[PDB]
Design an enzyme around this catalytic site. Structure first.
Site, PDB file in Angstrom:
ATOM      1  CG  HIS A 197       3.776  -8.291   4.231  1.00  0.00           C
ATOM      2  ND1 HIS A 197       4.819  -7.952   3.393  1.00  0.00           N
ATOM      3  CD2 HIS A 197       2.627  -7.814   3.712  1.00  0.00           C
ATOM      4  CE1 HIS A 197       4.282  -7.232   2.421  1.00  0.00           C
ATOM      5  NE2 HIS A 197       2.967  -7.112   2.574  1.00  0.00           N
ATOM      6  CD  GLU A 200       0.218  -9.456   6.407  1.00  0.00           C
ATOM      7  OE1 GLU A 200       0.938 -10.472   6.252  1.00  0.00           O
ATOM      8  OE2 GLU A 200      -0.497  -8.962   5.501  1.00  0.00           O
TER       9      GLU A 200
HETATM   10  C1  LIG Z   1      -1.151 -11.720  -1.561  1.00  0.00           C
HETATM   11  C2  LIG Z   1      -0.031 -11.219  -2.441  1.00  0.00           C
HETATM   12  F1  LIG Z   1       1.007 -12.166  -2.378  1.00  0.00           F
HETATM   13  C3  LIG Z   1      -0.489 -10.991  -3.911  1.00  0.00           C
HETATM   14  O1  LIG Z   1      -0.468 -12.233  -4.607  1.00  0.00           O
HETATM   15  C4  LIG Z   1       0.557 -10.013  -4.433  1.00  0.00           C
HETATM   16  C5  LIG Z   1       0.115  -9.156  -5.595  1.00  0.00           C
HETATM   17  O2  LIG Z   1       1.247  -8.395  -6.083  1.00  0.00           O
HETATM   18  P1  LIG Z   1       2.420  -9.049  -6.932  1.00  0.00           P
HETATM   19  O3  LIG Z   1       3.430  -9.591  -5.996  1.00  0.00           O
HETATM   20  O4  LIG Z   1       2.956  -7.924  -7.827  1.00  0.00           O
HETATM   21  O5  LIG Z   1       1.820 -10.092  -7.828  1.00  0.00           O
HETATM   22  O6  LIG Z   1       0.853  -9.169  -3.303  1.00  0.00           O
HETATM   23  C6  LIG Z   1       0.653  -9.855  -2.077  1.00  0.00           C
HETATM   24  N1  LIG Z   1      -0.123  -8.977  -1.201  1.00  0.00           N
HETATM   25  C7  LIG Z   1      -0.895  -7.921  -1.602  1.00  0.00           C
HETATM   26  N2  LIG Z   1      -1.522  -7.330  -0.611  1.00  0.00           N
HETATM   27  C8  LIG Z   1      -1.133  -8.040   0.511  1.00  0.00           C
HETATM   28  C9  LIG Z   1      -1.507  -7.902   1.880  1.00  0.00           C
HETATM   29  O7  LIG Z   1      -2.287  -7.073   2.349  1.00  0.00           O
HETATM   30  N3  LIG Z   1      -0.887  -8.838   2.690  1.00  0.00           N
HETATM   31  C10 LIG Z   1      -0.019  -9.808   2.250  1.00  0.00           C
HETATM   32  N4  LIG Z   1       0.451 -10.659   3.165  1.00  0.00           N
HETATM   33  N5  LIG Z   1       0.341  -9.948   0.972  1.00  0.00           N
HETATM   34  C11 LIG Z   1      -0.253  -9.049   0.163  1.00  0.00           C
HETATM   35 ZN   LIG Z   2       1.564  -5.771   1.460  1.00  0.00          ZN
END
Ligand SMILES: C[C@@]1(F)[C@H](O)[C@@H](COP(=O)(O)O)O[C@H]1n1cnc2c(=O)[nH]c(N)nc21
Ligand SMILES: [Zn+2]
EC number: 3.5.4.-
Length: 344
Positions: A197, A200
């Protein structure tokens, strides 16, 4: 608009816990009523927008519902079925492994629950090829990142194609890029593909150049790569010369306010120079969307014809992390479906 759901699609940027549907969320809530969590705390409705920090807070709520290997197994199976029903033929799921001592779950058994969900989905003969990318959360720190990379290296070899890479996600304001260089380079050297990523948020140019030096295989978002605040002609040129595919998430950027409107999304900028781009959901549950809906939004906003949408979908096959054999099989599948999807 049946075209967008019938159109064969590849999904390369979908976070497991962000992809939970309203139906699956309600089942998790029924199992843990003592948590006092409501479904409106996990979804950003149509016409509503939240800050990027507010989005991250919603993931803390969802993570409380998926605390055992059985929850991860059920979530994996439901998410896979929902993507397959939407016309997705190849899916690369993204998820950060977590321990939970209260349930006995480990980072290793978190990954094994996802692999079990993929195995059970194959037994059901679903028309979808599911792969897994192990996600490193910036909030976890550099020591948890080293453990996660070691775990990913082991599953990369043992799964023979199911586990294909590594992701760097989570709060972009937490930590420094230099803290993750060693474990990410280690994964790169082992043969893992990197999906990072990047860009952003604005004013992170130096941090972006550091992670770009790792030569990621795909970049997530890249929102501010061309912005004067956090990007430059040098960053755009680097991404262009190295032909790094961009995973573009339209509803995700609009609902998290990192882009003011669909019309002003950087998709148009990268599409104008035919730069490798893939339309993704990011978090289909949190952002209340489907991959077919993202394609429709991109087509309607940027005035793309059905044949131009077809070309985008077909070219996205080139940017998967699976071998040339899988790309070839997917291209054959697309060309077999083509006369049923595109009509005179
Ligand atoms: C913020 C998170 F780490 C969330 O805790 C996680 C949720 O999905 P999982 O890894 O399956 O728990 O996915 C990540 N995430 C989900 N959506 C995003 C996003 O838009 N940007 C970034 N940088 N990270 C994102
Ligand atoms: Zn993402």
């Amino acid at each position: 608009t049946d075209f967008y759901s019938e159109l064969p699609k590849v999904e390369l940027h979908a976070h497991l816990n962000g992809s939970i549907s309203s139906h699956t969320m309600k089942k998790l809530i029924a199992q843990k009523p003592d948590l006092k969590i409501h479904d409106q705390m996990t979804v950003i409705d149509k016409g509503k927008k939240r800050t990027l920090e507010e989005c991250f807070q919603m993931f803390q709520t969802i993570h409380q519902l998926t605390s055992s290997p059985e929850d991860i197994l059920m979530v994996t199976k439901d998410v896979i079925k929902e993507f397959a029903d939407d016309g997705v033929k190849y899916l690369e799921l993204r998820s950060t492994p977590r321990r939970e001592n209260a349930t006995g779950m480990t980072k290793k058994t978190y990954v094994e629950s996802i692999l079990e969900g993929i195995k059970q989905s194959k037994q059901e003969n679903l028309d979808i090829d599911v792969r897994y990318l192990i996600a490193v959360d910036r909030r976890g720190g550099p020591l948890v990142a080293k453990e996660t990379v070691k775990l990913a290296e082991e599953f990369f070899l043992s799964t023979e194609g199911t586990v294909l890479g590594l992701d760097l996600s989570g709060d972009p304001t937490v930590g420094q890029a230099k803290d993750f260089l060693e474990p990410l380079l280690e994964a790169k050297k082992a043969g893992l593909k990197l999906a990072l990523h990047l860009s952003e948020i604005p004013n992170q140019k130096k941090e972006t150049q550091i992670l770009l030096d790792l030569l990621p295989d795909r970049i997530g978002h890249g929102t501010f790569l061309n912005s004067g605040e956090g990007g430059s002609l040098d960053l755009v040129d680097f991404v262009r010369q190295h032909r790094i595919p961009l995973e573009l998430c339209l509803t995700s950027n609009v609902k998290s306010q990192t882009v003011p409107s669909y019309d002003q999304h950087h998709f148009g900028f990268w599409y104008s120079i035919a730069h490798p781009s893939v339309i993704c959901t990011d978090d289909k549950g949190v952002f209340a969307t489907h991959l077919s809906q993202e394609y429709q939004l991109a087509a309607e906003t940027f005035n793309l014809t059905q044949s131009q949408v077809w070309d985008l979908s077909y070219e996205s096959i080139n940017y998967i992390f699976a071998s040339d054999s899988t790309r070839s099989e997917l291209r054959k599948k697309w060309n077999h479906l083509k006369p049923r999807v595109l009509h005179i």
